[PDB]
Design a protein around this ligand. Structure first.
Ligand SMILES: *Cc1c(COP(=O)(O)O)cnc(C)c1O
Ligand SMILES: *Cc1c(COP(=O)(O)O)cnc(C)c1O
Ligand SMILES: [Cl-]
Ligand SMILES: [Cl-]
Ligand SMILES: [Cl-]
Lengths: 388, 388
C-alpha cells in the first residue's frame, strides 16, 4: 500500500505550532522545523473520512463514548502487542501528561520522591516539579559502545523513599525499545521497594524492524498490578490536534483515584472528532501505519548514511523506535549555547536542544524524521551548512 | 434571515449524550430528550464551513492559537456587551467547570468556605465538594409573585470567612438575567468582605427581548479587579462537543495562578477544530444567533401558552435568558420521586429533575427548548399525558 509520503504539504496555513511557534523558542520563525513531535504527513485516509462523516452530521453537542470506542483500543492492544486488557480498566484523558499529573497528585503526597531516567521527554521532569513532588533522576547509562541502557545499580542506590517511577517505553529521545529482560529487571526493583510504575508508552506503535514493543504491564500479573499505562493514537497517527489518550489501570483502587480526579476537574468527554478518529485509526489505520513505518525506516537509514558520509564528526545510533533521531554534536567542540546559535543563525533549522532533556543531553540534538524525504534532505543540508 | 430551525435532525447517529445516555440516568433510553443543555439544531453555517476548511487541510497536529482567536473574543465582548477587555486577560480552558475547579484549588485552601445560590447548575455544588472545600448555600428568594431574586440578607448572614462566591449570570435554571443594580448590590457585599467573585457567564448570549446581559466585571474598575469571568461559545452556538471556553482575569496575579494550574495539568492548547469554530462563531455567527433568539423566544411563548391552556396546575415564569424553562409541578401533590417516575414511565419524556439543582428545586423540572417546534410540541403532549 502506498500513501504518497513524498508529497510536500505546506503547513503555513495549518495553525501548526511546529511551523508557527518557533519565535518564542528560537528567536525567529524563519527556520526549517524538525523539532516538535508531530508529522508533516497527512493523516490516514480512514481518519480523514471518519472526520468527514462526523462533520457532515452538522451538530456538535455533548459527546457520548460508545462501547465501540474502548473496544477498538482493547482490540488494538491485543492484536498489536499481544496484551489482553479489560475495557473496564480504561480512563479517557485529553493527553498523557494531564493523566500523569493527576496520578502524581492522587498517588503521592507533597514532597514525595518520584524517579525518572534522563535524558527524557522534558515534561516528565516538569510534571513532578509543578506538582511539588521531589524529582529523583537516575540517568540512563551511555555505554562505551555508544548505546543506552538503564543504570540499575544507580536506580537501586536512589530508590529509598521513592513512591513512583515514570518509565518512558519506547524512551524519547534516545530511541530505546526496552527488551522484556530489561523491563523485568526494572519491574522487580520496583516491586521489591513498593514503587508503582507509570509507564508512558505513547510511542508504542512506532517500532522499527527487528524490534518489538513490550508493555511493562503485560509481562506478568504482578507487574500488571503494579503498573499504570498511558497510550494514545496521537503519536502513531499524527492526530495530537484532536486530543485523545487513555490510561490503563488494572488496579481498581488506582482506577477510582484517577476517575475521581477527572471528576474533580470535570474532564470526562472526548470532543466529537477525537471520538471518531480514535476508533477509525485503530480499526482501519493498520495498513497506513505499516506503510508509514516503512517510509520512516527508509528516512532513518538515509539520514544516518548522509550524516556518516557528509558530517562524519557527528555520531548517531539508529533508533529502535520513535521517529526521532538523537545526534551527538559534541566532537565539534562547541558549547551547547554555541551549537544552538549556529543551528538557528547559520543553518536556519530548528532541532530540539539536547540539554532540554536533562542529564546526559548536553551536546546532542533531536531531529524529527516524520517528514517527506525532500524536507529531510533539506534539513540535513542546513545542518551541514551550520557546522561548516 | 432564515436557517430552517423547523427541520427535524435525528441525532440517533450523532454520538449524542442527550440522545444516548438516558439509560443510566432515567433507567431507559426510549425517551424524548429535553434534558441536557445542548441544542437539537445544526450549527451555524459559518461554523460548519470553518470546520470543513480546517478538515480539508488533512493534517491534525499540535495547534497554535493565533492572535486572531483572542481578538475575536475581545471584539465580541465589546460589540455585544459593551465590555472592553484586553486579550492579555484571557486563558483557554476546555470547559467552564475545569477552570472553576482549578481556580478553587489555587485561590483557597482545604475546607475554606465558598458560597453559591441554589437552585443552580449542579456542578457548582459538586465542584466545591470534590475539591474538599466547604459549600455555603444562600438560596435564591422565591417571591410571592413567583419571581426569583438574590437573598441579600441571607448572603450577609452567611458571609463570614467565605473566600469565594460563585455567581451564575444568567442564572441556570431559573432564567434570571440579573440587572446592574442587582449585581451592584452583590458585588458591594463581596468587595466589603474581601470575597472574590467567580462569575459563570456561559449563557451570556442567550438573552431574550427587553433584557440585557451585564458582565459583573464590566460594572466598575473595582468590580473588574474583584471578578474572574468564565464564558464560552459553546452554549451560544451549540458547539459543546468541540470544547472551548475562556476565562477573563484582569488581575495579573490571578492570571498567573490559573496559568500555572493549567501548566501543572498540561491543558494549554485548543484542539484544531475548536480553534477555528470559536473564531468563526464570534466573527461570523451574529446573524445566526439573532435568528436563533427569535426562534427560541417564539418556542418559549408557545410553551407557556400551551402549559397555561392545557396544564393549568403547572406554573411557569418566562425566562429572561437561557433556553431552559423552569416549570413548577408542585400543585399535582406528587413527591419528587413520584413525578420523575410518571414523566419517564407514562410520559416517556426526559426532563432535568428540579431537586438536582439543590435547595429550592423540589417540585420543579427543567425543560430544554432549543429544539424544533415540532419536537417541543411532542414534548408538551407527553408531559400532559404523564400528569393526566
Ligand atoms: C509527545 C509525547 C507525549 C505527548 O503527551 P500529551 O500530554 O499526550 O501531548 C507524551 N509522552 C512522550 C514520551 C512524548 O514524546
Ligand atoms: C452547561 C453549563 C456549563 C457548561 O460547563 P462546561 O464545563 O463548559 O461544559 C457551565 N456553566 C453553566 C451555568 C451551564 O449551564
Ligand atoms: Cl563533520
Ligand atoms: Cl419581581
Ligand atoms: Cl394540569
Amino acid at each position: 500500500m502506498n500513501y504518497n509520503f513524498n508529497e510536500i504539504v505546506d503547513r503555513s496555513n495549518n495553525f501548526s505550532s511546529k511551523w508557527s511557534e518557533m519565535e518564542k523558542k528560537y528567536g525567529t520563525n524563519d527556520l526549517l522545523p524538525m523539532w516538535v513531535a508531530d508529522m508533516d504527513f497527512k493523516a490516514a485516509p480512514c481518519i480523514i473520512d471518519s472526520l468527514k462523516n462526523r462533520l457532515e452530521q452538522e451538530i456538535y453537542g455533548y459527546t457520548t463514548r460508545p462501547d465501540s470506542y474502548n473496544e477498538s483500543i482493547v482490540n488494538w492492544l491485543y492484536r498489536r502487542h499481544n496484551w489482553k486488557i479489560k475495557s473496564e480498566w480504561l480512563i479517557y484523558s485529553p493527553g498523557v501528561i494531564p493523566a500523569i499529573s493527576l496520578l502524581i497528585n492522587e498517588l503521592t503526597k507533597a514532597n514525595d520522591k518520584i524517579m525518572i531516567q534522563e535524558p527524557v521527554y522534558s515534561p516528565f521532569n516538569s510534571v513532578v516539579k509543578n506538582n511539588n513532588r521531589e524529582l529523583i533522576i537516575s540517568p540512563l547509562q551511555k555505554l562505551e559502545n555508544g548505546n543506552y541502557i538503564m543504570d540499575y545499580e544507580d536506580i537501586e542506590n536512589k530508590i529509598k523513599d521513592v513512591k513512583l517511577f515514570i518509565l518512558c517505553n519506547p524512551h524519547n529521545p534516545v530511541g530505546r525499545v526496552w527488551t522484556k529482560d530489561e523491563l523485568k529487571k526494572l519491574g522487580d526493583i520496583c516491586l521489591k521497594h513498593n514503587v508503582k510504575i507509570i509507564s508512558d508508552e505513547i510511542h508504542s506503535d512506532i517500532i522499527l524492524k527487528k524490534h518489538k514493543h513490550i508493555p511493562m504491564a503485560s509481562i506478568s500479573k504482578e507487574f500488571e498490578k503494579n503498573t499504570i499505562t498511558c497510550m494514545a493514537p496521537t503519536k502513531t497517527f499524527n492526530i495530537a490536534g484532536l486530543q485523545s489518550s487513555y490510561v490503563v489501570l488494572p488496579d481498581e483502587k488506582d482506577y477510582k483515584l484517577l476517575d475521581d480526579a477527572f471528576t474533580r476537574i470535570d474532564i470526562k468527554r472526548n470532543n466529537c472528532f477525537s471520538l471518531v478518529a480514535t476508533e477509525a485509526s485503530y480499526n482501519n489505520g493498520e495498513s497506513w501505519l505499516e506503510s508509514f513505518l516503512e517510509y520512516l525506516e527508509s528516512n532513518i537509514d538515509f539520514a544516518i548514511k548522509y550524516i556518516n558520509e557528509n558530517m562524519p564528526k557527528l555520531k548517531v545510533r539508529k533508533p529502535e523506535g520513535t521517529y526521532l533521531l538523537w545526534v551527538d554534536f559534541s566532537a565539534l567542540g562547541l558549547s551547547d549555547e554555541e551549537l544552538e546559535s549556529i543551528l538557528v543563525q547559520k543553518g536556519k533549522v530548528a532541532l530540539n536542544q539536547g540539554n532540554s532533556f536533562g542529564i546526559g543531553g548536553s551536546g546532542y540534538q533531536r531531529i524529527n524524521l516524520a517528514c517527506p524525504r525532500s524536507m529531510l534532505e533539506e534539513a540535513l543540508i542546513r545542518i551541514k551548512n551550520a557546522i561548516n
